[PDB]
Amino acid sequence: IWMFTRIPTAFLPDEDQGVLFAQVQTPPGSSAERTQVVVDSMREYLLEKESSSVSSVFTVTGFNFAGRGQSSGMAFIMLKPWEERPGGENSVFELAKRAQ
Amino acid sequence: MSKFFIDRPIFAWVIALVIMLAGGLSILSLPVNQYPAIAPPAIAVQVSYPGASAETVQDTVVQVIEQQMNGIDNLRYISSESNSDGSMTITVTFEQGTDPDIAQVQVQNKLQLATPLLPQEVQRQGIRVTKAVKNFLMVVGVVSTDGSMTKEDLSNYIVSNIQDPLSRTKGVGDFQVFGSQYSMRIWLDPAKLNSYQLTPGDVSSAIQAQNVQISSGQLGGLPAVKGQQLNATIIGKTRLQTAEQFENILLKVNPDGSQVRLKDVADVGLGGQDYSINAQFNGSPASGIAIKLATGANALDTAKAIRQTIANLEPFMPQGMKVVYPYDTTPVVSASIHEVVKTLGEAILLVFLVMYLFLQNFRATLIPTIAVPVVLLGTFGVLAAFGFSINTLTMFGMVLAIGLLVDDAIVVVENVERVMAEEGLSPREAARKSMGQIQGALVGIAMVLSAVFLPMAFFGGSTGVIYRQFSITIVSAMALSVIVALILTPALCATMLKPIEKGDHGEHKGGFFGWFNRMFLSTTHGYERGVASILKHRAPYLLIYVVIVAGMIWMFTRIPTAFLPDEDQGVLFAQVQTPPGSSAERTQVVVDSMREYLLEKESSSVSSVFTVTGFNFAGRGQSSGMAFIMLKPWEERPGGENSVFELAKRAQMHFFSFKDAMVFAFAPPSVLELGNATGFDLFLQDQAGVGHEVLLQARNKFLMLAAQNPALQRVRPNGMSDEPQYKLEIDDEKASALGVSLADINSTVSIAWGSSYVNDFIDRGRVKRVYLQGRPDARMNPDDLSKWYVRNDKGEMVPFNAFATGKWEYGSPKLERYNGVPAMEILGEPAPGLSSGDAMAAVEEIVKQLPKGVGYSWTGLSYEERLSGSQAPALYALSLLVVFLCLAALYESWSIPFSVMLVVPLGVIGALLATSMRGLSNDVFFQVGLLTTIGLSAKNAILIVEFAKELHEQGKGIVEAAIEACRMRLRPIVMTSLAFILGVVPLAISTGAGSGSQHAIGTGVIGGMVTATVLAIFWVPLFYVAVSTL
Amino acid sequence: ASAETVQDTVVQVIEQQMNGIDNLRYISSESNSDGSMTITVTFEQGTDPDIAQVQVQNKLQLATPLLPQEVQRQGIRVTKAVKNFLMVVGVVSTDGSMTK
Amino acid sequence: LMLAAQNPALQRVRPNGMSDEPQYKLEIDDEKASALGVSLADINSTVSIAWGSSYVNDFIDRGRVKRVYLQGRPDARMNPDDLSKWYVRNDKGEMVPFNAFATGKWEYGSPKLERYNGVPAMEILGEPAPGLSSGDAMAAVEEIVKQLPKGVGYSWTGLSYEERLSGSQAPALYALSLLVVFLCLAALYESWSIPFSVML
Amino acid sequence: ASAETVQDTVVQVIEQQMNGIDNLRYISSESNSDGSMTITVTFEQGTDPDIAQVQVQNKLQLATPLLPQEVQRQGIRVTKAVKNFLMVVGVVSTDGSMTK
Amino acid sequence: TAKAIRQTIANLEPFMPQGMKVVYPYDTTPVVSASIHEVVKTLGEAILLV
Ligand SMILES: CCCCCCCCCCC(CCCCCCCCCC)(CO[C@@H]1O[C@H](CO)[C@@H](O[C@H]2O[C@H](CO)[C@@H](O)[C@H](O)[C@H]2O)[C@H](O)[C@H]1O)CO[C@@H]1O[C@H](CO)[C@@H](O[C@H]2O[C@H](CO)[C@@H](O)[C@H](O)[C@H]2O)[C@H](O)[C@H]1O
C-alpha cells in the first residue's frame, strides 16, 4: 500500500520514433524576412553541428503547428536509423535536450 | 441441469450473482423517458418568405423543393403546407427503424441542391431542416409579470442569455424558442419620402452601401519589398450597430447643401423579425422554449438539470421577467417509476404472506424473495442489451410479468415442500425428485409463452413499437424466470429447507395454522369431489363450456375498441377560429375572454393559460389562435368534476355561446407524438391538374355526403377555407405612359408592404438582421397604397393610384400538398361503436363519387392500420400453431394439447366481463393484459395435464389421474392467484398521474385471474379426460 | 474580419449547435485575424466517425442561417480530424532550373 | 508561464497563442468623403483589391483551371502612408485622393483567439522535467494554477485528458478483475475457501 | 455550352475538390455537346452508399459556389445508383392524338 | 423495386389521359423470375428423379 503511493504516474512510456519538431515562432508583427533567417540558422546549427543522429531537415515558414502568419515557421527533423545511433546522446530525448 | 446445480449451489449462487451485477450495472446506464420512439421518424423543412402569400410560397419555394426531394431511403410519404404568413413546412416521413440522423442528412442534401432554384430572398433567409417528432420533455416560458417587455424582447433574451447555457445543460436535446433575436427595423413613411422624391428602393440600396464590412488586406503582405520586416493586418470598419447609426446613413443632398438622413423618412429601432405569432402567459407578454430529451438521457435528471441552469440565471434577469414551467412530462414519468417499484415490492411482500400462511416456514419464504429480484435485475440487463429504455410501456411490462415471476418461484418451492411431506424425502432428494417432475414442462412452458408473446413484437408501424415494448420486457422476464427456476431455486430448496415427517399436513398444530390446515385440507377433499362429480356427469359441463365460449365472442362484439386509455395528462387544448377577415387584435380578445374565464371561474382545475394569436393546429394567420390550458397537479384537484374530461365539457358549453368565433376544447391524444388516436386521416389529391377550384368542390362534396353517412361523424377538413384577398391590377399601359418602370413598381410594393430583409448589422456581438418596410398606418387599408409614390424617367413621383387598381377575390390562406400534388386533408371518425376499419370502408366508397382527376390517400395512423390490420390474423395463427406443436412434443400426443389450449376462453371471459362491466375499452393495455392472463392460465393447465399424464402412465386410470393431479396442483394455483390478484388491486383502484393506464391493466387481470382460477381447476381435468376418452 | 468578429459572428454560433451531439467529449475552436476559424469537436472512442460527421453536418446547418451572408454563400468545410502527418513527399530541383 | 519557468519539475512550457499583435485600424468616414468624391461606397471596393488580393475568375493553364488574382503592386501596400497613394473616382469625372478621407492608426488586436467548451481560453503545452513523469508535471501544474485571478479556471485536454481518465479507471478495473477471479474459482471448485485463499 | 465549356467551367471545378473521401477507388467524368456532364466517383466494395453520398456532396458543395449561375439554377443531381438501367417505362398514344 | 414501380404507375393510370397507354419497352426483371422459376422446375425434377 505504501509502495503503491510512491510510484509516479504516466500514461505512455516516451518513445524514440526517429523524429523531432522545430517549433519557431518569431515575435509577432515580424515577417518571413526575420523568421526565415531564424529558421535557416537552427536548420544548420543542427544539420552540421549534430549529424550523428539527424539526417534530413525539411524546413517551412508560414504554417507551424501553432498559428499561420509570417511570424511562424517549423521543421520536420528526420533522423537516421536506430543502429546508426548509439544510446544516450543519440536519443531524440537527448538530441533535443541540448538542441533546445 | 437442475440435478447438476442441486449439488452445486455455489456455482448456482455465482450465476445469480453475475445476473444481479449485470442488471444493476445496466439499470444505471439505461435511458429513462416517457415513451420510446412511437411516431414514424420525420423531418421538417422550414422557411418563411417575408411578405409572401400562400401561393407565392407554394409555387416559388415548396414546389421547387418537392421536385428535388427524391432518391432518399426509407421514405413513406412527403406532405407540405404553404401559409399566408409566408411560412412553409415540408415534412418527410420515413419507416420506423430509419436512423433519424441519416434521414435528416439525406433530406438536407437534396434541399441543398434545390437552394439555388429558390428565390434570392428565401435563400437569404436560410431554410432549416430538423427532426419533427413532437415528444417534448417540458416547455418553459419567459413571461414579463408586469408589462415592461414585449414578446419580441423576451425572445431576444432567451436567445441571448437563456439559450447557450440551456444547450450545455446535461441531457438537453433539440428545442424551439418561440421567437428569434432582435431585428433592426426601418419603418418607411410614404409622405416624408414623397417630399424628397425618394422611394423604398433608394433606402435599401443606401443601407446596403453604408453597412457593409469592407475586407481590407494586410500591411506588408506577400510578396513584399526586400526588407520591410513589419507586417500587420489592417482592420477596416465593421457593419453598423445602433439604431442611431442607421438613422444617419444619408440618402441624398439638396442643391441648397442640406442633407437627407434616413431619420428624415422613417423611424428606427430594434424589433421583431417576424410578428405573425403572438403569445401571453395568463395575460402577460411571453416567449419560451420547448425542449426535447437527448438520445440516451434521463428524463428525470434533465428536468432537474434544466431547472438548475435556469435558476442560476434568475438573479440577473431584468425586473419583471419570470421563468415558469407550464408543461412538464416528468411528473407522469416519475409517478410511473414509483407506482411500479411499489407494486413490485408489494408483490414480493404479498408472496411472503401467502407463502407463510400456507407453508408455515420462514426458510421457504426466503426462496421467492431471493429469486424474484434476481430475475427483475436480469430483465433490465436484457433490455439494455437489446437497446430498449426505461419507459411507461417497459415498466407496465414488468407489472404484467409479476404474475409469471411470482408463479415460477411458488411452483418450484411448493412442489419440493409437498414431495417432502408426502414421501418423507430429504430436501436434496425432494428437490431432485421435484425437478424431475417439473422441468420438462418448464422448458415446455418457456417455449409456449414465447409463442404467445413474441408475435406482438412483429407488428408493424407505431402500434408495433408500443406492443414490442410489452412483448420484449415480458419474454425476457419469463425467460429469465425459467432459467432461474432451473438453476438457482431448486439449489436454494435443497439447501435452505428442513425435512417434514412423511404424512404431516399440520392438522395438529392448533391455533390459526391448525384451523387453516384442517380448513384447507377439507376444501381440497371438497374440490376433489367436485372434480370427481364433474368427471361422471360430463355432458352438462362440456355444454356450459360452449356457452362460456359463445359468451366470450358475444362480449368481444360489444366492447368498444380503442388505441390507448383516456389519460389525464395535466393539459387541455382550446382551438380558436375567428372569421375570415379578422385581425390578430380581434382573435386576441376571443382568447382573453377565455383566459379570464378559465383562470377565474375554473380556478379549482386551472393553473395557467398559455394563449396564442397567429398559430393554431389546423392553421395559421391572424384568424387562428389557441389556448394551452394547464392544470394543477392531480393531487390538488380530486373528484370527477375536476377531471380534464369534465373541465372540457364546461369549457365547451361556455365557449359555445360565441356566435362570433368558432371555439373548441379537447383533451390531447394519449400519445402526443402520434396526434389523433381514433379516427381517420386522408388527403384528397388533384392527380391531374384539375385545379384548386375543382379540388375545393371535391372536398366539399366529400364533406356533404360523409355527413349523410351514418358510418362516420365529426368529419371536418383539417386545413383552412378560402378567404377574401385583395388583388392588385397594374395597368402597364398607363405605367409606361407615365415614365414609371414596372420593376420599380414591384420593388415599391415588396419593400414597403411585404417587407424586405436587406442587411446584416451587429447587435451586442452577434449578427442580427436589418428589415425595411412601410410604417403600419401606411399599409392598413386599400386607400393606404394610394399613399405610396414611385419615381419616373425624370423625377416626378407618381402615386400608386395613377396606375394601379384593386379588386376583391378569393384565394387559399393555406395550401397543402401530399406526395408532390395539390391536396386537402380530411379528419373525422367512425360512428359511435363502429370501428375505424368500418369508417375506412364507408370512406373508400364516398371517394368514388369525387370529380374526375381527384384521388386520395390515407396518411398517418390510417395508413399504418391499413397495413398492420392485415398481419394480426397471420401472427395469431403462428402463435396457435407453435403453442400446439410444443404441447405436442411435451406430451407426445397430437390430441392432449387440446386440453390446455381450451383454457384460453376460460380466462378471457372474466377480463371481458370486468372491463366491459367497468366501462373501459378494448385497447392496448387490455390486449397485453389479456395475453398475460392467458399465459398464466395455460401454465396452470400445462402442469395439471403434465402431472396427470405422469400419474396416468405410472399405472392409474384416466379419471383417477385427473383427480390426483388436480389435488396436487390446487395449493400452488390458489397461492399464486391469491398473491397476484392482491398485487394488482392497487392498480385497479388508483387515482391521479397515470391512473387511466393503471386501471386499464388492473381491471382486466383481476377479472381474468378470478374466472381462470375458479374455472380451469374444474374444466381442465374435464378436457383432459374428455379428450383421452375419444 | 478580425479574429474578434470571426469569433462573435461565426465560431460562437456554430459551437451553440454542437452542444447536445451524441458522445461528445469536448469542443475547441480558434478565431484568427486572417478571417479563418476552426472548430474541433472531439468524441469518445467507439463513436462511429462517419455518424459523428453526419451529426455535425446536421447541427451546423441550423447555425448557417444565423451566420453572416458572406459565409452562408461561401461553403463550410467539414472533415475528420487527424492530428498527425504520415509523411511529406517533397520535391527539390537538382540543376537549379526550377524555383519553389 | 513565469511560475512554469520557475517551477523545478516543469520543462519546455509554452502557449499555443501569440499575446496580441499590432493591427492598423483604418478608421475612415463618409461625411468628408461623400462631399467631393464618391457616392455610396465606391471606395469599399478600392480597399479590398489592392491590399487584399481580390479573386476575379478562373483561367486554363496548361490544361487546368487555376485562379486569377488582382492585387496592387508590392510597394503600394507596405506602410501606413503608402496607402495615401491610392486614388479613387470622383462623381464629376475627376480623381479624388485617398487622404481626402483616409485616417489610419495603430490598434492592438489578438491574432488567434481560442475557446474551450464555449468559454474563451488559452492552451499551453509543456513537458515534465528530465527523470520525472507526466503525472509529476501534472501534479505540479495543478499548483501553479492556484495563484490565478478567481475568474480563470482550467481544464485538461489531449494526452492529458487521456491520462486523467486512465488513473480514474484503474480502481474499478482492479475491483472487477479481482471479482471475476473470485467468482470463477468459486464456481469451478465448488467452494469459498479456495477463492478466499488466492485473494490473499 | 460546349463540352469544352462544361469541362472547364463545371467538370474540373468539382473534380479538384473530390478528395478526402473514404474508400475512394476511382473518379471518372464526361462533358458533352448537349451541355450535360457526369462525374462518377466509384468506391471500394463494402462501402456504405449513404456515407459515400454524404462525402461526395460534402465536397461538391465546396465547388458549387464557383460554378456559373446558369448551372446552379439548372439543379444538380447526386445519386447512389447502379450502372445498368433496370427498365424503362414508356407511354404511347392510343388515338394517335399526342406528339412525342 | 420493379414490383414497387408497377404499383406506382398502377396507382396513376386512373388519372391518365385518353389517347394513352403505359408500356414497358426495356425491362431486366423477367430474366430473374425466369431464372429461379426454371431452377425450381429442375429442383422438383431432381427430387423426383432421386
Ligand atoms: C402542451 C403539449 C405539448 C405541446 C408543446 C407546445 C408546442 C410548441 C409549438 C411550437 C410552435 C409555436 C410556438 C408559439 C407558442 C406556442 C405556445 C406553446 C406553449 C405550450 C405550453 C413553434 O412555431 C414556430 O416558431 C418559430 C419561432 O421562430 C417561427 O419562426 C418564425 O419567426 C422567426 C423569427 O425570426 C423567423 O426566423 C422564422 O423564419 C419564422 O418562421 C415558426 O414560423 C413557427 O412555426 C409551432 O411550430 C409549428 O408546429 C407545427 C405543429 O406542430 C408544425 O407543423 C408541422 O408539423 C405538425 C406536427 O404534428 C404537422 O401535423 C403539420 O401538418 C406540419 O405542418 C410546424 O412545422 C411548426 O413550425
Numbering used by the authors:
A (entry chain C): 553 to 652
B (entry chain B): 1 to 1030
C (entry chain C), E (entry chain A): 52 to 151
D (entry chain C): 703 to 902
F (entry chain A): 302 to 351
Authors' account:
Newly emerging MDR gram-negative bacteria over-express RND-type multidrug efflux pumps, which cause resistance against an extraordinarily wide range of antibiotics by a single factor. Among the three components of the complex, active energy coupling and substrate recognition are performed by the inner membrane pump. There are two distinct multisite drug-binding pockets; the proximal and distal binding pocket, in MDR pumps. Here we show drug-bound structures of MexB from P. aeruginosa with high-molecular-mass compounds.
In order to identify bound drugs, we exchanged DDM by the large molecular weight detergent LMNG, which has a molecular weight almost twice as much as DDM. Surprisingly, we clearly detected the electron density of bound LMNG in the DBP of the MexB crystal structure, regardless whether or not drug was included in the crystallization medium. The binding site is composed of the PN1, PN2 and PC1 subdomains7 of the binding monomer of MexB. The hydroxymethyl group and the eight hydroxy groups of the glucose moieties of LMNG form hydrogen bonds with the side chains of Gln46, Glu81, Thr89, Arg128, Lys134, Ser180, Gln273 and Arg620. The other alkyl chain of LMNG is elongated parallel in the space above the inhibitor-binding pit. Two maltose moieties are oppositely elongated towards the exit and entrance of the DBP. As a result, the LMNG molecule spreads throughout the DBP space, indicating that the DBP has sufficient space to accommodate a molecule with a molecular mass of more than 1,000, if it can specifically fit to the binding site.
